[PDB]
Design a protein around this ligand. Structure first.
Ligand SMILES: Cc1c(-c2c([C@H](OC(C)(C)C)C(=O)O)n(C)c(=O)c3ccccc23)cc(F)c2c1CCCO2
Ligand SMILES: Cc1c(-c2c([C@H](OC(C)(C)C)C(=O)O)n(C)c(=O)c3ccccc23)cc(F)c2c1CCCO2
Ligand SMILES: C[As](C)(=O)[O-]
Ligand SMILES: C[As](C)(=O)[O-]
Ligand SMILES: C[As](C)(=O)[O-]
Ligand SMILES: C[As](C)(=O)[O-]
Lengths: 131, 131
């Protein structure tokens, strides 16, 4: 309901931060300059401002040890194979549309759109609203 | 239902792109480096990937003339005093929390969170889900 999994993946020497709403498979993603606490914190603030984020999961717990990330979670009131499949599907879609944009970040957002419409977007709206 | 108003506002020599979902008052915002078509286009791709965006309104139509923006609207299938009040409320909240962060962008996302929880976030979930 309020559980999100956040992980970073690397592509073309850039870092893609991927958040998956576990119950629906819905994704939000950003291309970030480096895999740093400051970027993770800022991403969390944005995420928490639009969805009711209760709990964050990750495949790399050390991701969430910086004072900056701890601050974001404190302020927003957050605590610590669906996700694997959603990440798999996203990487595949990026591959499929990559040639249609100059910038990786553009391909990433095209892939997020395709994924969420193919839905995960309808399902998250349903879960948060009925809950 | 699918109508969003996008406008830029300037604060501390930076540019804040503010999108308001007209029916609910819900806001998404980003601090962007410059008031350019490339930034607007990228913002639209992200917005359209998470919400069902049908129509975009603005107080400055010239904002949406670049080939980049036209491309975003084409690809995502988008066409061209609530908004004034929501923008007013956002600027006020940024003012109120500004001293709590180093970076303006951080204050902006704190203000978006406060605004959406004070709700606009619950109402958009309701409108998109029942529609
Ligand atoms: C100050 C701060 C920080 C914080 C920052 C802020 O910048 C980020 C880009 C990391 C979000 C800021 O603008 O102040 N910075 C820059 C820090 O250096 C920092 C150090 C320790 C603890 C928090 C922060 C991080 C947060 F997630 C946060 C807050 C305030 C409440 C909302 O959540
Ligand atoms: C190529 C492109 C462009 C586009 C780009 C892209 O970069 C942005 C940062 C502007 C999103 C890109 O990565 O290719 N660029 C860089 C252009 O120079 C451009 C020029 C004319 C028309 C579209 C674009 C803009 C779009 F909104 C877009 C697309 C493809 C379909 C999805 O929507
Ligand atoms: C989520 As990774 C830094
Ligand atoms: C630091 As997080 C919950
Ligand atoms: C929305 As303004 C560039
Ligand atoms: C360019 As827009 C609809």
């Amino acid at each position: 309901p309020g559980i999100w999994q956040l992980d970073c993946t690397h592509l073309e020497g850039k870092v893609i931060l991927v958040a998956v709403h576990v119950a629906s498979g819905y994704i939000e993603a950003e291309v970030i300059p480096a895999e740093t606490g400051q970027e993770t914190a800022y991403f969390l603030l944005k995420l928490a401002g639009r969805w009711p984020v209760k709990t964050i999961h990750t495949d790399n717990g050390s991701n969430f040890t910086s004072a900056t990330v701890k601050a974001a979670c404190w302020w927003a009131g957050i605590k610590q194979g669906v996700v694997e499949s959603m990440n798999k599907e996203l990487k595949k879609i990026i591959g499929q549309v990559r040639d249609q944009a100059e910038h990786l970040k553009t391909a990433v957002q095209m892939a997020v759109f395709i994924h969420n419409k193919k839905s995960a977007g309808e399902r998250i709206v349903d879960i948060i609203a009925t809950d």
